Design a protein around this ligand. Structure first.
Ligand code: ADP
Ligand code: ADP
Lengths: 177, 177, 516
């Protein structure tokens, strides 16, 4: 029903283009015939559109002392990673807005890269999603399929957004090599 | 039935038909009364072990039906194939006869596959080639000998093995399977 | 009402009760016997079917757990010990829901029956559903009510069948699997709140115990691997295959075929003939197939009128199973010069191989070694390294012996071993070359295995269990192993290594001394 979709947006900050798309799809749903193929298509589409956290951010811990304690508590050593996270927090504190970076941890297996990533998420109070690019070989697993095709599921960043329900999710891409 | 897409017929719709516990209440969309197919013997055929979806592949019991040896093929050709081909082409046994010798030669040099279909094709070819003579008036009877068989089935597809009545210093006889 | 007393007997949650009475009043606007009527009917039937508060009491008692585990299965002492450790840890922690157990090993070892045994031991309700390339979520979560194909799914069907809120769900063949659905099924953050598609109301899968089975772990996705505790289940030796067949396989199959003991029999001798001849695996799957074959043909016999009571002795066994396969045996009872008995760890299991060498041209210029056997790049490298070490060893030990460095040899290693541990025959190759160069045959009943480096160090190998099993089965009295496999050889059993003079070595020189 259009009610659920209209309501799931009342707690978001939806951009104008997304709102245009949602409105035209809702009119299309109103005009379509129930439990038909096109209706299922438009329903799945509106579901995925209205289950994106459009203006929601989680509130981060910017206290250097507490973050440093949380880091020193879960892992020994790793001074490069810990200094990098502390500088990240200092720069995010010198501004008001939230910051976005792209880091790469490389090293032998079993040295705590994934675990320190989870600990960084805990210290920053962000969410935490991880997907593997370990051997994947189809670009659709990242970019998504059209709506025309039968399977038609959106990527994996869209799925991590829908899951974490926030826009500061600390994605972890394992095995990029 | 390769793949299951929009309400896939291959497996989901058939497993509950081949599952021993499910089918006892078989729900058909029309005539919405779950019926029991308990006392029902299901025999499936295939020509590949794979390309059967595993949820069925583990429900059935694969029985292998391998090909036929030359003497099996000869017995089949004499019990069934030649009489049926005569019944179809409308030729009596006297107007054209196929000895066990010529049938053995046909099998040995023309039909070395696993099934009897190519053998039936060759027998039908011989019988209709002789019927043509009977009808065109020449040779009011026909006899097929291992010498003039090339006139009915063409040149052999395989190569003939040599034969040595006295072996030279180079060759040795051996038994193959 | 039927549905009313249904929900009255069991402890329903409030939101569920609200929704069910809502849909019941929605049917109250009667639309008798239509699509929108039977949809509501099936919905309410599934709802009153699902158990809501009722559960099964558990039993974390180690004594009864041990009794059940030893009763339901033979052997598997280490797997049983791991199960008891899990049970004790889960009694301490009290939750019994932390990490998922996953048994892996060769096919036919009965890692699917351990789940039933565990359900019995924990007094839970068992349920199994396999995942072989399902590629869909409709098996787990189901379909929507709008589709003409409206099914709740595997989980809700499990709940309706067990009538229990805390059952045991085995997941078969994970390594053959769609996976994100399993993640949502196993993660305790969302098991407590599980959403079926055919049932918009959620479900609580927090007290549910999940087990997994697989054939190999490498193909299981690393997300799941991080969430499973892997238990290794190994194959059975012939001595315990016999016990399994006598106590479980033959009674089960005789029940399957509608027979009983007074009409169809299988002696220990014919059973072990089956085990050693018509089966060369590490499980009991092919043995179970052969036993079922025997019993089905015996049933046909006793129906056809003849043989009111049938007996299968090792002499009339070919009437049932056919001609003996895997009959080929030791190729050399006294090996000539240039032949050595190595041990191989093949796919099916251990084997004994006869590495052979022969001069090929009559005897400046250097000699040459050509190697047969379907060898790969690594195995050709191993042959070259062994060749060079044997050359140098001879030119140091017998400096006047000219055989290796001038003659043209032909080496043949039989094609049994896996692509890995192919280099395990290095010491065998070196000894074959030395035995050919000198005029001496190798010690009489002597088998060997181990890697050799360019300077003669004996490097460790794998599959010591299979290799020593095949070595004993082939009637070998003296076995040679590398020194880093002392643990592997001594920690396997005592009824396998009794009359077996074993020698552990580190360099090749002492292999040479104990082989000549
Ligand atoms: N410096 C460290 N301090 C504490 N634990 C560590 C450290 N390094 C590794 N570990 C432990 O090793 C385990 C496995 O590490 P993991 O994160 O799987 O390595 P990888 O980098 O391959 O993902 C983790 O559970 C973690 O607790
Ligand atoms: N140690 C054992 N004791 C009793 N039965 C066994 C044992 N090992 C295997 N089995 C038998 O093997 C069969 C199950 O094989 P299983 O190991 O489940 O194969 P898979 O692992 O491929 O599913 C069962 O019928 C079971 O009786």
């Amino acid at each position: 029903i259009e009610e659920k979709f209209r309501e799931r947006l009342k707690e978001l900050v939806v951009p104008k283009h997304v709102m245009d798309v949602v409105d035209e799809e809702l009119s299309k749903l109103g005009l379509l015939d129930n439990h038909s193929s096109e209706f299922n298509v438009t329903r799945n589409y509106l579901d995925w559109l209205t289950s994106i956290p459009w203006g929601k951010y989680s509130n981060e811990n910017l206290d250097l002392a507490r973050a440093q304690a949380v880091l020193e508590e879960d892992h020994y050593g790793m001074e490069d990673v810990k200094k990098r996270i502390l500088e990240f927090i200092a720069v995010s504190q010198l501004r008001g807005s939230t910051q976005g970076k792209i880091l790469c941890f490389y090293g032998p297996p079993g040295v705590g890269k994934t675990s320190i990533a989870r600990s960084i998420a805990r210290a920053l109070n962000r969410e935490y999603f991880r997907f593997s690019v370990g051997g994947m070989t189809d670009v659709a697993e990242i970019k998504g399929h059209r709506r025309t095709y039968v399977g038609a599921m959106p990527g994996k960043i869209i799925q991590c957004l829908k899951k974490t329900k926030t826009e500061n999710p600390l994605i972890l891409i394992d095995e990029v090599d | 039935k390769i793949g299951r897409g929009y309400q896939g017929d291959p497996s989901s719709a058939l497993l509950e038909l081949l599952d021993p516990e499910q089918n006892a209440n078989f729900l058909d969309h029309y005539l919405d009364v779950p019926v029991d197919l308990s006392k029902v013997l299901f025999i499936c055929t295939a020509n590949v072990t794979d390309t059967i979806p595993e949820p069925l592949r583990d429900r059935m019991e694969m029985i292998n039906v391998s090909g036929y040896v030359a003497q099996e093929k000869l017995a089949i050709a004499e019990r069934y194939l030649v009489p049926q081909a005569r019944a179809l082409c409308g030729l009596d046994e006297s107007k054209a006869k196929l000895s066990s010798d010529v049938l053995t030669l046909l099998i040995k040099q023309y039909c070395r596959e696993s099934g009897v279909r190519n053998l039936q094709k060759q027998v039908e070819k011989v019988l209709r080639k002789s019927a043509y003579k009977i009808v065109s008036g020449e040779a009011e009877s026909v006899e097929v000998t291992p010498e003039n068989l090339q006139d009915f089935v063409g040149k052999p597809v395989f190569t003939v093995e040599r034969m040595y009545d006295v072996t030279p210093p180079g060759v040795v006889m051996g038994l193959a399977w | 009402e039927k549905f009313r007393e249904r929900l009255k007997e069991l402890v329903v949650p409030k939101h569920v009760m609200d929704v069910v009475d809502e849909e019941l009043s929605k049917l109250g606007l009667l639309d008798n016997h239509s699509s929108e009527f039977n949809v509501t009917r099936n919905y309410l039937d599934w709802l009153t079917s699902i158990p809501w508060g009722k559960y099964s009491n558990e039993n974390l008692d180690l004594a009864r757990a041990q009794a059940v585990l030893e009763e339901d299965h033979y052997g598997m002492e280490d797997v049983k010990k791991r199960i008891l450790e899990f049970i004790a840890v889960s009694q301490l922690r009290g939750s019994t829901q932390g990490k998922i157990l996953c048994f892996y090993g060769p096919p036919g070892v009965g890692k699917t029956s351990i789940a039933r045994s565990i359900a019995r031991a924990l007094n839970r309700e068992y349920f199994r559903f396999s995942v072989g390339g399902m590629t869909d979520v409709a098996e787990i979560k189901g379909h929507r009510r709008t589709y003409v194909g409206a099914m709740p799914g595997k989980i809700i069907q499990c709940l309706k069948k067990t009538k229990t809120e805390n059952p045991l769900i085995l997941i078969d063949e994970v390594d053959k699997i769609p996976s994100s659905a399993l993640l949502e099924l196993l993660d305790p953050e969302q098991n407590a709140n599980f959403l079926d598609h055919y049932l918009d109301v959620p479900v609580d899968l927090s007290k549910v115990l999940f087990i997994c089975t697989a054939n190999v772990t490498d193909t299981i996705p690393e997300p799941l691997r991080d969430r499973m505790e892997m238990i290794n289940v190994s194959g059975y030796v012939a001595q315990e295959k016999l016990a399994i067949a006598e106590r479980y396989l033959v009674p089960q199959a005789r029940a399957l075929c509608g027979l009983d003991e007074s009409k169809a029999k299988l002696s220990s001798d014919v059973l072990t003939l089956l085990i050693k001849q018509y089966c060369r695996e590490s499980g009991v799957r092919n043995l179970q197939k052969q036993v079922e074959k025997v019993l089905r043909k015996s049933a046909y016999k006793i129906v056809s009128g003849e043989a009111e009571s049938v007996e299968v002795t090792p002499e009339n066994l070919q009437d049932f199973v056919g001609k003996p396969v895997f009959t080929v045996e030791r190729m050399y009872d006294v090996t000539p010069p240039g032949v050595v008995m190595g041990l191989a760890w093949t796919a099916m299991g251990g084997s004994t191989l006869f590495v052979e060498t022969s001069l090929r041209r009559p005897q400046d210029k250097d000699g040459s070694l050509e190697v047969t056997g379907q060898l790969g790049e690594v195995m050709k490298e191993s042959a070259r390294i062994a060749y060079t070490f044997a050359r140098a060893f001879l030119m140091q030990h017998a400096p006047a012996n000219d055989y290796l460095v001038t003659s043209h040899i032909h080496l043949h290693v039989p094609e049994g071993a896996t692509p890995k541990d192919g280099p395990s025959a290095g010491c065998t190759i070196v000894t074959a070359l030395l035995s050919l160069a000198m005029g001496r045959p190798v010690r009489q009943n002597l088998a060997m295995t181990g890697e050799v480096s360019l300077t003669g160090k004996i490097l460790p190998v794998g599959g010591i269990k299979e290799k020593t099993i095949a070595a004993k089965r082939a009637g070998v009295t003296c076995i040679v192993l590398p020194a880093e496999n002392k643990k592997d050889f001594y920690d396997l059993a005592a009824f396998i290594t009794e009359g077996l003079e074993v020698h552990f070595v580190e360099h090749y020189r002492e292999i040479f001394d104990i082989a000549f």
